[PDB]
Amino acid sequence: MIQRTPKIQVYSRHPAENGKSNFLNCYVSGFHPSDIEVDLLKNGERIEKVEHSDLSFSKDWSFYLLYYTEFTPTEKDEYACRVNHVTLSQPKIVKWDRDM
Known part of the structure; x- marks a missing residue:
């Protein structure tokens, strides 16, 4: 009991482009x-x-x-992005996205 599960919001900060080093932001909250x-x-x-x-x-x-x-x-x-809060009995490797 007392199992506040991780609310993921895994977003791109900058516009994703190969070579042109960008910014990947895994943000987890609520837990x-x-x-x-x-x-x-x-x-x-x-x-x-x-x-x-x-x-x-x-x-x-x-x-x-x-x-x-x-x-x-x-x-x-x-x-x-690995996601493994204590509630997660198995590490959920939540893939990010590609906004573009």
Whole structure:
């Protein structure tokens, strides 16, 4: 019990173009408690170069953080995002999108 599931909103910040290094923003919120894992993960390559906007639980009754990277979609790369809050018994590798 007490299982606030992660509400994902995984968006492109900048207009996605190959070579022209862009910005991929996995943002998860709505959930609690703190125990969540979000590795950005391509076809089979983990992006270790992750910056965040830190834990901001809005000091209300929520829990969240923004987890962004400067992604470069070379040729036919499909960038995706691990989602594994404590509620998720299995890590859901939610693929991002391609707005364009």
